[PDB]
């Protein structure tokens, strides 16, 4: 197993930008054939994967000139002149001359944009589902830029693991912001012996935990 | 060169689930088929090739007895069984051609998802979710729904019969343990609600199910 190691692991441009994304392998990728196998491939919003270039510089067929692929030995570049519209999409590095077969994790291109703050939302649990005998709190963090945002649950002063359920928007086709979901499930034992409950929200636009609290009645 | 895959499949846990992939139009190469998991969104591995010509079949060490690898050369069909289907083997799965020289998998089947799950179909609880919380940020409201623990997918969830459908976010569905539950909000002006009617619509066709949740105040 040779680890393939890619860099950025998210890369945001301007549609129009120049874009490298980097890969180096564990070990050097030059077989005794003769060949160094390194190949890239693009997969798109949910299709399959689609090489692009193998044998780090040959272009495959229908992949235009945009693209380019070079190196050695461990260490390589897929580069994009223009990032056209098209282009955006996960990137990862393959390697063929060691056994088995591995990728790198995917070099995600996305669209840039200016830093958007979430717009916290906490919602208590609902009288239907308090009387199913369950109590699911939710907090909608909508619409925020960077996606790297960090969700605490807390009740009562200690922090709260057991029962998040956490997901996720990808870019959003309009605005670019990216939205994710915080549900915490407890009982309606639980739920009616504590109080305060806060969705705090970490995010890098404040140095301040956006923090939307409820309490129980109190 | 075409590779058409079954799909989707629904396996118990500690089953097992045979997958075929059949490769057309690239009569006379020596080529092979490729498994690849993906494991979500971005991890790739590597799961084993198999020549539909000679039988050449080769593993990744991971896979090997999880995963059985044959063709059926007379019909070029791969096959791939896994068998004892854990929760964690809930992937999707590609298969695809390389043909010799270069070494790349330069042709690619549409992938296969197996959802490994203890359910049967399961009907949705559809919740309301009003903004009483904390209140309104002054001229906008925020309202959920929460659908919780279905099996299998989908629901669909729409505002308003799809009259409402700026500002509303769908979260993908996540397999809470065997079954699933996704939530969805929209963001209407504060004159609106509840001055207006806001409605969360649902309705799980593997179940016969239809719910229309007005979100009352």
């Known amino acids: 197993d040779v680890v393939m190691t890619q860099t950025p692991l998210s890369l945001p441009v301007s549609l129009g930008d120049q874009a490298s994304i980097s890969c180096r392998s564990s070990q050097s990728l030059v077989h005794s054939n003769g060949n160094t196998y390194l190949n890239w491939y693009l997969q798109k919003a949910g299709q399959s994967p689609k090489l692009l270039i193998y044998?780090?510089?040959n272009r495959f067929s229908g992949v235009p000139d945009r693209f380019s692929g070079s190196g050695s030995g461990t260490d390589f570049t897929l580069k994009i002149s223009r990032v056209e519209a098209e282009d955006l999409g996960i990137y990862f590095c393959?390697?063929?001359?060691?056994?088995?077969?591995?990728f790198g994790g995917g070099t995600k291109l996305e669209i840039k944009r200016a830093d958007a703050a979430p717009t916290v939302s906490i919602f208590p649990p609902s009288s239907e589902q308090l009387t199913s005998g369950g109590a699911s709190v939710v907090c909608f963090l909508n619409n925020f830029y960077p996606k790297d945002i960090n969700v605490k649950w807390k009740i009562d002063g200690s922090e709260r693991q057991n029962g998040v359920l956490n997901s996720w928007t990808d870019q959003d086709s309009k605005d670019s912001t990216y939205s994710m979901s915080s549900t915490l499930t407890l009982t309606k034992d639980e739920y009616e012996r504590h109080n305060s409950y806060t969705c705090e929200a970490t995010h890098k636009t404040s140095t301040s935990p956006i923090v939307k609290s409820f309490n129980r009645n109190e | 060169v075409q590779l058409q895959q079954s799909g989707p499949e629904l396996v118990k846990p500690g089953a097992s689930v045979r997958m075929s992939c059949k490769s057309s139009?690239?009569?006379?190469?020596?080529?092979?088929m490729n498994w690849v998991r993906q494991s979500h969104g971005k991890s790739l591995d590597y799961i084993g090739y198999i020549s539909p010509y000679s039988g050449v079949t080769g593993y990744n060490q991971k896979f090997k007895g999880k995963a059985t690898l044959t063709v059926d050369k007379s019909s070029s069909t791969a096959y791939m069984e896994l068998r004892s289907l854990t929760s964690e083997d809930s992937a999707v799965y590609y298969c695809?051609?390389?043909?010799?020289?270069?070494?790349?998998?330069?042709?690619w089947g549409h992938g296969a998802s197996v959802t490994v799950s203890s359910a049967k179909t399961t009907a949705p609880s559809v919740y309301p979710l009003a903004p009483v919380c904390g209140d309104t940020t002054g001229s906008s409201v925020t309202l959920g729904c929460l659908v919780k623990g279905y099996f299998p997918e989908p629901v669909t969830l729409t505002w308003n019969s799809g009259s409402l459908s700026s500002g509303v976010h769908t979260f993908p569905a996540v397999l809470q343990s065997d079954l699933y539950t996704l939530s969805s909000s929209v963001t209407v002006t504060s004159s609106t609600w509840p001055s207006q009617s806001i409605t969360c619509n649902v309705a799980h066709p593997a179940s016969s199910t239809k719910v229309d949740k007005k979100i009352e105040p």
């Open positions: 139009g690239y009569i006379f190469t020596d080529f092979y």
């Open positions: 044998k780090v510089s």
């Open positions: 695809a051609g390389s043909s010799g020289n270069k070494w790349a998998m330069d042709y």
């Open positions: 393959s390697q063929t001359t060691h056994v088995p077969p591995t």
